[PDB]
């Protein structure tokens, strides 16, 4: 079968803590003797509108940060700021700290989100970095400091920390160096994203998945050149397909006996005609948050 | 609205592998018992037509290889309860959570922690279909993977994976070994009944749309539960039970829309169609979000 699947979240759960400053509580990520969290926790209502973070931060003491791991309070023995992430040095090391790395993902890549509130894990789901550097998440008040991640063997690669919601209801955040994905800023203002586009290489991965699971009504006998497909793709605000994308799709191509450019001819027909009421893998819409690797691992 | 799974860490800490000869699947290690599908004791050729009691009497504790990772847990006792094997082991699982075993109803959702060789690979949310199948994602070696809900700190185990049906859906038991539906653990052709739409979950979805301001479909009329059930069955929708009416209670109260009034609105959508409109950004009515799922994502 075929399902939007997240990585098992245990290794990350054992890192989550609650961080409080003033009347603001959000989540932190406790790795070794450091807790990472969004810097906008240090803001008041008034601050949030135009926070001079270097200025606000210097006025805080270690003791203004309350960090709790369950019942236990952790003692902050130092604080600093790296871009939009606050780093809290604590007197004790997290024994549940996994093998980890910090990475910056590219748009079109997917990752798992462990949504937390008051330092407690609440749910896990799979998301993609949109081409306009938003993510379509499920994040409520208190969710800031929730992280996104991938797991390779025994290693957790952290790629996202959550900071904000935009008026359209999508979400924005940073990598674990504190740099935003996209043109956003951690200030309480209405911010719009660039126009989004659909992740074409992922739509093609998902069409291959629908074939692998016996769903092929959208196929056709026609074919297309790469550039002629890309011309139509861009017309419909789909990302153009690169030769690296073609190559990445090979295993799915091999496994199903459907040349990539044949699948592109199928997608072009769907873009131009629509789904005629039909569904693919249950969906009325072309799904673009499965990468080729996601589909491969799972089939 | 996304399908959101529960954080899987409390369950990851209970997964082991169970091997008889070369047949390896997953087991669930709680306190000093390991629970797994009984067909682990069957050779490939045994599965064609197994005699489980006879296969079991021939077995001894020392024919069972139970491993957490690569660490052996010695089996000191074995019994069969319906279609699950219970293996008493000489070590109480230090990671055992607060837990219980529950048998869920069609329509209820749970998270599945897909595992291979006792290693978690992925977590996703499933609904139990009215025909007592789940639309899972399971490969060879996945049996013994479990489905669960988490309430506060208590893990309620409701599913253990045993088999795949011709249509590519999946079937299994509760943790007492009792199959959901009319299936048996024999490698013989079996077929799921025709599936129906989960009415209580569609209703939850409509409540979700209203909570978010999308309420064009509300009408000025009501209906009896009996009239609705009779009409719904003509559209291959499940009849509502009293338990369904009850679990819609909070969403009814949150919106001020009586359950039976929402039923009349759904009847009108069934009889007259969407007339080209959308609800929550979709022309399809969604049926795998329960009233709890809606609450846990809106509030
Ligand atoms: C345990 O890991 C395994 C999990 C399976 C295999 C891959 N995906 C799964 O979900 N379970 C079995 O192999 C199971 C063992 C039996 C003792 C129950 N047998 C099984 O799943 O296949 C037999 C099924 C039973 C109904 C049926 O018609 N059938 C034949 C195939 C035909 C092709 C499509 C799938 C069903």
Swiss-Prot record, chain B:
Residues 1-299 form the Peptidase C30 domain. Residues 1-299 are cytoplasmic. Changing residue 203 to V: In strain: Zeta/P.2. The active site is at 39 (for 3cl-pro activity), 143 (nucleophile). It is found in: Host cytoplasm; Host Golgi apparatus; Host nucleus. There is a cross-link at residues 3, 88 (Glycyl lysine isopeptide (Lys-Gly) (interchain with G-Cter in ubiquitin)). Changing residue 187 to A: Does not affect ability to cleave and inactivate human TRMT1. Changing residue 130 to H: In strain: Omicron/BA.1, Omicron/BA.2, Omicron/BA.2.12.1, Omicron/BA.2.75, Omicron/BA.4, Omicron/BA.5, Omicron/BQ.1.1, Omicron/XBB.1.5, Omicron/EG.5.1. Cleaves the C-terminus of replicase polyprotein at 11 sites. Recognizes substrates containing the core sequence [ILMVF]-Q-|-[SGACN]. Cleaves and inactivates human TRMT1, preventing tRNA guanine(26)-dimethylation of tRNAs. May cleave human NLRP1 in lung epithelial cells, thereby activating the NLRP1 inflammasome pathway. May cleave human GSDMD, triggering alternative GSDME-mediated epithelial cell death upon activation of the NLRP1 inflammasome, which may enhance the release interleukins 1B, 6, 16 and 18. Also able to bind an ADP-ribose-1''-phosphate (ADRP). This is 3C-like proteinase nsp5. It comes from Severe acute respiratory syndrome coronavirus 2. The gene is rep. The chain holds residues 3266 to 3564 of 7096 of the full protein.
